[PDB]
């Protein structure tokens, strides 16, 4: 039903916002996202920039992504993101994550026709 | 703007040879896999060969193996594809391809406008 893009894009994209706004960020947008559904996912990267910005990043540096493959995109510009990371004390089904904001480049995996991402891979 | 210039197409005689070129212009970097696709008229578009930046991991059809060469500049933005024996199935629009992995079609996003190549019985 979801596609790979529409996927990326609830999963990672929040162009509402220029950074996490509170400290409890994550915990609100990692559950209304549906990131904590069958459970609590791990570690997840929102980007607070624009749709056509972020799509734009599959035309700029090509690098390997971390499995292997070499369909991964390194955006030229830093980006606003916020890296949402699993606590201690969180446990399925009430998952605590704890908001870290940052200006990073990102890597994305692009694939499809329009060539879009369809995968967060790093931050760097 | 980048664009991706092929080079090459022709029409020659069962068991002729033909060699394609293509080049990429406009790119700040290398992509590490370029490779050729075609599209016989009608069917699908189906993977020919691919090579990354470095000496390569190099990948053919199972159709050309023995038969086509690929070859890139080392560390260039450039793709050729020596055509030798070529034989009335080869017959079809070639298409040079950037910056996805071996053969998988939907990770290419840079695509050649393409390039005929008929070869006759």
């Known amino acids: 039903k979801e596609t790979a893009a529409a996927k990326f894009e609830r999963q990672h994209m929040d162009s509402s916002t220029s950074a996490a706004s509170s400290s409890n960020y994550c915990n609100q947008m990692m559950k209304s996202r549906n990131l904590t559904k069958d459970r609590c996912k791990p570690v997840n990267t929102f980007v607070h920039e624009s749709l056509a910005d972020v799509q734009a990043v599959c035309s700029q540096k090509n690098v390997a992504c971390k499995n292997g493959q070499t369909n991964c995109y390194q955006s030229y510009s830093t980006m606003s993101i916020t890296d949402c990371r699993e606590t201690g004390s969180s446990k399925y089904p009430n998952c605590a994550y704890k908001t870290t904001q940052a200006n990073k480049h990102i890597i994305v995996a692009c694939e499809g026709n329009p060539y879009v991402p369809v995968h967060f891979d790093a931050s760097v | 703007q980048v664009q991706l210039v092929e080079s090459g197409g022709g029409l020659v005689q069962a068991g002729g040879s033909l060699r394609l070129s293509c080049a990429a212009s406009?790119?700040?970097?290398?992509?590490?896999?370029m490779g050729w696709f075609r599209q016989a008229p009608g069917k699908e578009r189906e993977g020919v060969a691919a090579?990354?930046?470095?000496?390569?991991?190099?990948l053919y059809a199972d159709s050309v193996k023995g038969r086509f060469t690929i070859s890139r500049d080392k560390g260039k933005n450039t793709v050729y594809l020596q055509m030798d024996s070529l034989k009335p199935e080869d017959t079809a629009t070639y298409y040079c391809?950037?910056?996805?992995?071996?053969?998988?079609?939907?990770?290419?996003?840079?695509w050649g406008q393409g390039t005929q190549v008929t070869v006759s019985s």
């Open positions: 391809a950037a910056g996805g992995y071996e053969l998988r079609d939907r990770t290419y996003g840079q």
């Open positions: 090579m990354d930046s470095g000496g390569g991991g190099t």
């Open positions: 406009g790119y700040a970097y290398t992509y590490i896999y």
